[PDB]
């Protein structure tokens, strides 16, 4: 299954899938890189046997808390992973928050990103998150 | 944790969660009811520790293929179940299918659901049915 | 064109359509009624030749500013007019707010709505909005 | 009012805004290049005071019908123009068919596109559309 592996975003966030077989994988998730703060478990399923020359369906899901923060929200990425020798995944975001009833209209937000192998350097880190910090990034 | 248990939609679409801890949960989904081939492996997370007054933040993902079928497509929930006496989950859900790279903007449907712990009567699936189906029935 | 008329939904809100002819469509938006603080400038499209048998596609944008009030914040809708003799409008929208670079991520919001001919009454109002307020209320 | 002028995507789509004031916009939609066939009318709102420092929150929308040619489909797009001396205007799309009650899960798609002044080169719209066409592209 291709999905193994380690996966970087244009903003600085790593996804890194331990396992995956029949279907499912399990991993890991930062927002940052390399501090147990603002790393969080990660679950998905895939299409372990998708249409030749199709790219492979994913979807997982990230609750934003762990032993040093809860941000009271939960994120889930659908899309697709494409091989080739340029490996990336496509997909939309959203992210969900527990709300009192009134304010079921502002519980979820809708979003992008784009993951490579190729881990970007700092220099265009800093030039994209410039531009604008599109993936999720919830506060305490 | 309450989101163990059984959920409905107004469709005839079942949720079972068999185990929830931590911060995981597991189970299945049908959109069928009954039947070992609409029915496919569940995985997902939950805000363990909600804040005091709101909703329960969640999200899962559900991958369209078991040994019977494969539709080739992936879809992922993200809302919040609501507790109370009256138990809930509202989510938005996306369905993504793998496709050719001319294809990519035709990959993502998006859609609403609501699940409850009243399941409800085979006369109001299809007056709901017939008003419109608008929860994932992928074929093939 | 069926699109003429008054919608309302569950929660209270209620769009005016004025005028609408090859293709394009104009009104108001209330998330109130009958006062002109929450009144709001409306403007769509729609398939002014549907395919036989099927629903209207349509879309419709409104700005959250008026002479009285301006929450930053524009909203679009997108689904489809079902006639037949129960009328309906059933959409998805997106709410986008005008942020800083380092805030896109938490620009827009996403939710579902229902539109209907058939003004509920304010008690069937007070029990929906009681589950929960899923249409856009943007505040100041 | 910033977003007068043309706007590019990378994929080859041209949007032509011809007119703004007091909080409305219109103008054009192209997914090609100076072909009659393949350009629609746009309608949209713009916030028409914002916020110091944050962008100006954008929404409108396309009917993919003319004189030539019917998809059967209705676009909105929703986000923000960013000003400075590097403009831009970020946005999810949403495409919603007409369908049938039955095939109402499936009558929408969603999307992401970001539009510029800088008209890209032909072999950057080329090398974008090999890794993937995002943007809508509705046949017949």
């Known amino acids: ?18 396992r995956a077989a029949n279907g499912g994988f399990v991993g890991t998730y930062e927002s940052a890189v390399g501090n147990a703060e603002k790393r969080y478990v990660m679950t998905g399923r895939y299409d372990s046997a998708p249409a030749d020359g199709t790219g492979t369906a994913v979807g997982w899901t990230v609750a934003y808390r762990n032993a040093h923060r809860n941000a009271h929200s939960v994120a889930t990425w659908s899309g697709q992973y494409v091989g080739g020798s340029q490996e990336r995944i ?51």
Request: charged share 15%.
């Open 90 to 140: 496509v997909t939309q975001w959203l992210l969900s928050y527990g709300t009192t009833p009134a304010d079921q209209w502002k519980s979820t937000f809708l979003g992008h990103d784009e993951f490579t192998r190729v881990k970007p350097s700092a220099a265009d880190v800093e030039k994209a998150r410039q531009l604008g910090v599109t993936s999720a990034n919830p506060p305490a």
């Open 1 to 18: 299954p291709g999905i193994l592996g380690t996966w970087y975003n244009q903003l600085g966030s790593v996804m890194v899938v331990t």
